Amino acid sequence: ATPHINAEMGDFADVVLMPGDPLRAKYIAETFLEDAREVNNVRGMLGFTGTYKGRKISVMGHGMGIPSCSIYTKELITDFGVKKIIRVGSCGAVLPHVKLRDVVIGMGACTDSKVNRIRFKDHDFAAIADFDMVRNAVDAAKALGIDARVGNLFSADLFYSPDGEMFDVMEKYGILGVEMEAAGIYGVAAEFGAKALTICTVSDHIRTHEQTTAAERQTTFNDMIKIALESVLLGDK
Amino acid sequence: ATPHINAEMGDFADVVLMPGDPLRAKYIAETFLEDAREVNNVRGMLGFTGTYKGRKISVMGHGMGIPSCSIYTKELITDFGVKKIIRVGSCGAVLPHVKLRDVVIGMGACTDSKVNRIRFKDHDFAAIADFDMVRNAVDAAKALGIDARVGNLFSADLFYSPDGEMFDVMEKYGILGVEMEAAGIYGVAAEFGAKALTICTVSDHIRTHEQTTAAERQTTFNDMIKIALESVLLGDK
Amino acid sequence: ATPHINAEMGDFADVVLMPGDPLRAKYIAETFLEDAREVNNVRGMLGFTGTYKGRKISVMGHGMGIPSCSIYTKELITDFGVKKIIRVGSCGAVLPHVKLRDVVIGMGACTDSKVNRIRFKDHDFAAIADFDMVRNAVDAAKALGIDARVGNLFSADLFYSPDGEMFDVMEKYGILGVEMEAAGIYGVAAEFGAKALTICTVSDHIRTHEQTTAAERQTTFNDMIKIALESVLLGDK
Amino acid sequence: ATPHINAEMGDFADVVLMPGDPLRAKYIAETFLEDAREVNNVRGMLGFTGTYKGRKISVMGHGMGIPSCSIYTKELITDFGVKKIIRVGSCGAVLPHVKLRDVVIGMGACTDSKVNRIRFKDHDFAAIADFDMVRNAVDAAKALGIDARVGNLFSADLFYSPDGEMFDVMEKYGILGVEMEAAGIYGVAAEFGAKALTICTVSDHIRTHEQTTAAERQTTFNDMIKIALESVLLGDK
Amino acid sequence: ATPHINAEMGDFADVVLMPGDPLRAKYIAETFLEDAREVNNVRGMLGFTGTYKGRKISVMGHGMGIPSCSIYTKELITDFGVKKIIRVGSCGAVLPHVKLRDVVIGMGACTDSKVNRIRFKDHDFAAIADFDMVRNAVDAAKALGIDARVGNLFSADLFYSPDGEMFDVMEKYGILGVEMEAAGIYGVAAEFGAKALTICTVSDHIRTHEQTTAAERQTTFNDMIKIALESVLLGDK
Amino acid sequence: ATPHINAEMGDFADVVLMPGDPLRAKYIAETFLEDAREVNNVRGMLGFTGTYKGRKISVMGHGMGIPSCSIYTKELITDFGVKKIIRVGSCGAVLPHVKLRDVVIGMGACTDSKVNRIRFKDHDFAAIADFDMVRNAVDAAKALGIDARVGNLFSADLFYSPDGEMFDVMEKYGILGVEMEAAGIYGVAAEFGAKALTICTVSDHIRTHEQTTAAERQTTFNDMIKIALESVLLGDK
């Protein structure tokens, strides 16, 4: 066991899907995985392990923010033999052409966190996903008839930022989605020699706003999970 | 409602106790509060409101890390009229004389987060608690026969820090406990004009280690909550 | 003797009150201390030792700015056995409700100095007073019928700032007074294992021109000194 | 003409390959392009335009370092209608398993330059390549039977670093090659709304002395150029 | 009058020599100036105006540290018509071949203060003296047969630095003397539109800790003053 | 030979003049030097050695930007016995009273590069020229009846800066010319133990954008070269 995961080596698959919302883990397990078994409950961060088309997959929420997801992803990698982490979540958009419910794949993640500067002697660490994982997700999306955008996310420490002007800067430099985890997950992946990818669906436009329905949201969430799961199978080849 | 709290103005008391572990909220409500009612369930962050010796109190977990607790504390203050937040949690000790199960009260909180530099034009914001809340907790502890230490916490972004030498620096400068939230809560309190306090019990010594029992841990957790609750009553005068 | 203090161990009390102006230290000794003798005059930085209600007390100027006061406080602590420093100064106010002549107690001090980043591995050190000293000062003020606000000071390196915009930021985050020393003294206290407190009277407002009389201002200054001295007597018990 | 390029719109193709050495751009044009004409010689920074398998292509040196290449890439993009830049260079390796002659594709580039912090409000901009360009290069390499590693470069400001310790850090975080330009070019591409990719061949190792033959090294260099050129043809489709 | 100087336009010469110690300003006035009158004593910061060889000259202490001297130099420049400031101070040496009592002229000044970053948008401002003044001092020293080195000073915020290793870096980069003011005075001169020079005498050795006689101190102190005063006369021609 | 210069000890004079443009080095060799021989052409970075009035002199381009010139100056110093580097460059003016074709001498150089912070433990290193060299250039200019201003340059990493407002700050602080090298050359001179000076001719105005004739360019270019060359002769005496 580790400080935040009451489990033993072997309880997790070598691939873990991670939503921020812990309630989604059980949903994913019941909706997409066969023969799922409970493998963690510490702090209510429920974790499950089962199979998707015969392939062992685990799912466990990561909580909000870089510090939270950094804890879970580190423990998974160092103590549970996890090789790949796929964060599946939502993001806010700043680009006019990026629309609600679009699927965005973070090949890179900008951040205003200090965690990577702490790792990288106060220089600029480019927080990046594993390239094959990115391409697997793009290909899996295309096979499902979904076109996904690939580029930079911005991983914010403050959901409520006092710096209103930063959204304009994000937009100028082509940021596709704003969330709060990717750069931290990518940093941990590099630190401990594993691979990661963050996929998000656009839940908000920080410009236009203009909302959606619960059924549309569930459909889109399901699409994202299908993409993530099918992408793993392509990665296995 | 707010993005992370499905409730309305009035559903929360003007004082909120916040553990990191969401499972503790329900425990606190059932163990210490009368007539408790459920007021939030979004993302499983259960929130309750009831009374302690007639005084309205709410309890809701804040999740791990500065970004997570910054979201909840902000929403509580700006949308739910919350005036005081008391984080109640655990910390790791670096000072030899600070012992397992000691109660520590963070009058200040150091941090390696960038969130306060972002707020404060890249200068040093001293992240501090409300003084009366600190003194109320000290006095409430003394009335319960518990001596509490008052000083600086260190609010870490990385539970698993690559900088081993930082613990020595923390120790040199008198840091009483290491946790992951106080500086962020204090920053939000200052940003939105409210008051906050972080109280922690020492769960680990990052030096000696040397563990405890489950019964001892529960007793100590109960002591901390009693301190927090009684401290509120002193604050009311 | 030390490089900036021509005195020997025993010449100072274990508590030293410190105004910025050495002429003001002579004022304090003459006005409040019995049997006061000058114990330093190097660089004109007058220091005195005498008694207050039978208690040995010293008072000595610290000069203007963090680097100046850091020299004197360090030397007192490491070479003259000084355990407590109480800065007694003036500050400017930025908050509408903070008025000329208010007494402000710096439980914390923000700063644009780099000195604490230098001490603390480029992270945020919360420069704090000693809690018991703060409480003693609050209680002494109450006994004298004086209101005292407890919160953050801002210790500035530049009395004449190019960044007028920083005053709006201090106001936003609730800074009670602007001065030039507290964060430096609190950093020295932490570094060398002593205790400190800064008390100021508001001598100026950013907006402004409320003004008072010389007699009233000098009365309030004296009240600050009485609070400081009486706080020592409470600590002793 | 621009301040550093004496040419007119149309003189360049919409894709430009860029080695650091202008003598190497002449080499590439002579070796791989048909009907190549020199289109720039300002400051000796030779640029050429010709065809590869009937496709219009340009090649031009970028000089050494982020500031030099930032000038040329900006001017090409804003004044010569250039849509894609492919840097073709050499890099040093720090990872044991990365060998002399390996082909490295910089999906991201780390850096100790301040240029992106200047662009991005002092936060972390993940300097990334264009994903489709990365995929085109990976696919072209595969068609040529060449292995290509995709990951982070480190773009250094100082070829002769005082900080020997930074190489251990790059190695720890998995950097595939050290060069001097990629992060700068990726920053320009993002700023001015174009697309870029850096491909390097490993010319040196930190440890070391594996060595090869001139013929083999030059063969691998040519393979990098073929990968670059063929990647364009794949993008066109 | 200004907030720290009780005097009026005309009371100061257009050139002011400034040691850190007000008592030294007094010594300089008594020893070198004719018809010297005291023009300030606010905060004990003695200032005098007299003549040297018929030339009107002032001398006034500036206290210790960048924040202190920044106050006095600013006020002199903006409110007393002062055109040139010549700091005449002491410094500690780090270079083995720099000896006690050596005269050093700071054409530039390094610093660990944040003040110039605050002025210069967090970039590197090279804090430099006025060239004509440097040259005047060099020539005067030559006419007096006094040796003088020209180069970089380092202006420290912490006389008692916790970073002993930085002295190795100063030594590496050829720093001639460590003092606490020059870089701030140079930044004020630039901000407020005047001219400045810092001359120091090596009063201690940071490595050897070695010693001097009372007689030696102020005959060399005298050499520094003579250089400063004669340099003004050259500048006048 | 070194990695960027194919030559041997003795091929270069102990003084090297360096423009950014290799073609200008060629022009200088042909115009000012007798018996000039080409000693390098690696990367097209032409270098020549000849005599000026019997004095052995070299001239070689250093390319654009701090990283480029840092490579060449280092190699010359460590492997070719070069004692003095004189940059002879162009710059853009920000001050209204600085005119096209004005000659500026950088006694200091500000910068937005991180290179000196990397050298100087993230403090402010004042990047300064050798004083004797500055004085030699001033005197030579006077003997030639050529006006020359002495002061700060600013060495930019981005010729195309996204921060237009910084030019207001440079203007405020009296920056004489904006170029891209001086601060890096000065940092190399200090690191590797040689001497350096940057002289520039104002080739454009950053505000007016105004214009010059071909004839005007290189007669003033010529004035700069004459100053540099004659300054060496003075230094030799």
PDB file of C-alpha atoms in Angstrom, chain C residues 3-4 20-23 41 43-44 64-65 67-68 70-72 74-75 112-115 117-119 157-160 162 180 191, chain E residues 3-4 20-23 41 43-44 64-65 67-68 70-72 74-75 112-115 117-119 157-160 162 180 191:
ATOM      1  CA  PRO C   3      31.174  45.403  13.861  1.00  0.00           C
ATOM      2  CA  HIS C   4      28.275  47.866  14.377  1.00  0.00           C
ATOM      3  CA  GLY C  20      14.149  53.366  13.105  1.00  0.00           C
ATOM      4  CA  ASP C  21      15.342  56.791  14.314  1.00  0.00           C
ATOM      5  CA  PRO C  22      18.225  56.742  16.805  1.00  0.00           C
ATOM      6  CA  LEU C  23      17.036  60.147  18.113  1.00  0.00           C
ATOM      7  CA  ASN C  41      26.880  55.207  19.647  1.00  0.00           C
ATOM      8  CA  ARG C  43      27.441  55.266  13.458  1.00  0.00           C
ATOM      9  CA  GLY C  44      25.235  57.432  15.647  1.00  0.00           C
ATOM     10  CA  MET C  64      15.927  52.580   7.695  1.00  0.00           C
ATOM     11  CA  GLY C  65      15.275  49.470   5.639  1.00  0.00           C
ATOM     12  CA  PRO C  67      19.392  45.621   5.291  1.00  0.00           C
ATOM     13  CA  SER C  68      20.065  48.149   8.070  1.00  0.00           C
ATOM     14  CA  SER C  70      18.995  43.066   9.725  1.00  0.00           C
ATOM     15  CA  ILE C  71      22.523  44.017  10.806  1.00  0.00           C
ATOM     16  CA  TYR C  72      21.526  45.346  14.224  1.00  0.00           C
ATOM     17  CA  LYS C  74      21.418  39.838  14.105  1.00  0.00           C
ATOM     18  CA  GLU C  75      24.243  41.264  16.216  1.00  0.00           C
ATOM     19  CA  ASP C 112       9.357  43.118  -2.084  1.00  0.00           C
ATOM     20  CA  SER C 113      12.795  42.354  -0.677  1.00  0.00           C
ATOM     21  CA  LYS C 114      14.667  39.234  -1.891  1.00  0.00           C
ATOM     22  CA  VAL C 115      16.236  38.513   1.527  1.00  0.00           C
ATOM     23  CA  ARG C 117      13.863  34.169  -0.860  1.00  0.00           C
ATOM     24  CA  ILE C 118      17.617  34.060  -0.406  1.00  0.00           C
ATOM     25  CA  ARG C 119      17.162  32.317   2.946  1.00  0.00           C
ATOM     26  CA  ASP C 157      12.641  48.365  -0.070  1.00  0.00           C
ATOM     27  CA  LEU C 158      11.764  51.596  -1.864  1.00  0.00           C
ATOM     28  CA  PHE C 159      10.136  54.424   0.163  1.00  0.00           C
ATOM     29  CA  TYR C 160       9.894  56.144  -3.219  1.00  0.00           C
ATOM     30  CA  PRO C 162       8.322  53.438  -9.124  1.00  0.00           C
ATOM     31  CA  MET C 180      10.393  49.152   5.692  1.00  0.00           C
ATOM     32  CA  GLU C 191      17.243  32.442  11.033  1.00  0.00           C
TER      33      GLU C 191
ATOM     34  CA  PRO E   3      10.636  63.727   4.697  1.00  0.00           C
ATOM     35  CA  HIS E   4      14.189  62.791   5.847  1.00  0.00           C
ATOM     36  CA  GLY E  20      27.302  55.377   5.272  1.00  0.00           C
ATOM     37  CA  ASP E  21      28.298  56.654   8.729  1.00  0.00           C
ATOM     38  CA  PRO E  22      26.986  60.160   9.671  1.00  0.00           C
ATOM     39  CA  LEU E  23      29.916  60.464  12.055  1.00  0.00           C
ATOM     40  CA  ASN E  41      20.330  66.192  11.588  1.00  0.00           C
ATOM     41  CA  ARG E  43      17.356  60.890  12.311  1.00  0.00           C
ATOM     42  CA  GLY E  44      20.928  61.733  13.244  1.00  0.00           C
ATOM     43  CA  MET E  64      23.413  51.276   5.687  1.00  0.00           C
ATOM     44  CA  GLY E  65      21.808  49.364   2.850  1.00  0.00           C
ATOM     45  CA  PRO E  67      16.773  51.141   1.004  1.00  0.00           C
ATOM     46  CA  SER E  68      18.437  53.696   3.314  1.00  0.00           C
ATOM     47  CA  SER E  70      17.941  55.241  -1.818  1.00  0.00           C
ATOM     48  CA  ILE E  71      15.840  57.568   0.379  1.00  0.00           C
ATOM     49  CA  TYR E  72      18.599  60.146   0.884  1.00  0.00           C
ATOM     50  CA  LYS E  74      16.458  60.530  -4.135  1.00  0.00           C
ATOM     51  CA  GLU E  75      15.557  63.489  -1.886  1.00  0.00           C
ATOM     52  CA  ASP E 112      21.226  40.591  -4.799  1.00  0.00           C
ATOM     53  CA  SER E 113      18.629  43.310  -4.180  1.00  0.00           C
ATOM     54  CA  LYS E 114      15.360  43.257  -6.090  1.00  0.00           C
ATOM     55  CA  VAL E 115      15.191  47.055  -6.510  1.00  0.00           C
ATOM     56  CA  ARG E 117      14.403  44.357 -11.218  1.00  0.00           C
ATOM     57  CA  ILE E 118      11.421  46.265  -9.891  1.00  0.00           C
ATOM     58  CA  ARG E 119      12.513  49.246 -11.998  1.00  0.00           C
ATOM     59  CA  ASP E 157      21.232  43.236   1.169  1.00  0.00           C
ATOM     60  CA  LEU E 158      22.582  40.886   3.857  1.00  0.00           C
ATOM     61  CA  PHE E 159      25.814  41.838   5.628  1.00  0.00           C
ATOM     62  CA  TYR E 160      25.350  38.472   7.369  1.00  0.00           C
ATOM     63  CA  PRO E 162      23.395  32.741   4.851  1.00  0.00           C
ATOM     64  CA  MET E 180      25.686  47.572   0.518  1.00  0.00           C
ATOM     65  CA  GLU E 191      15.623  56.780 -12.289  1.00  0.00           C
TER      66      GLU E 191
END
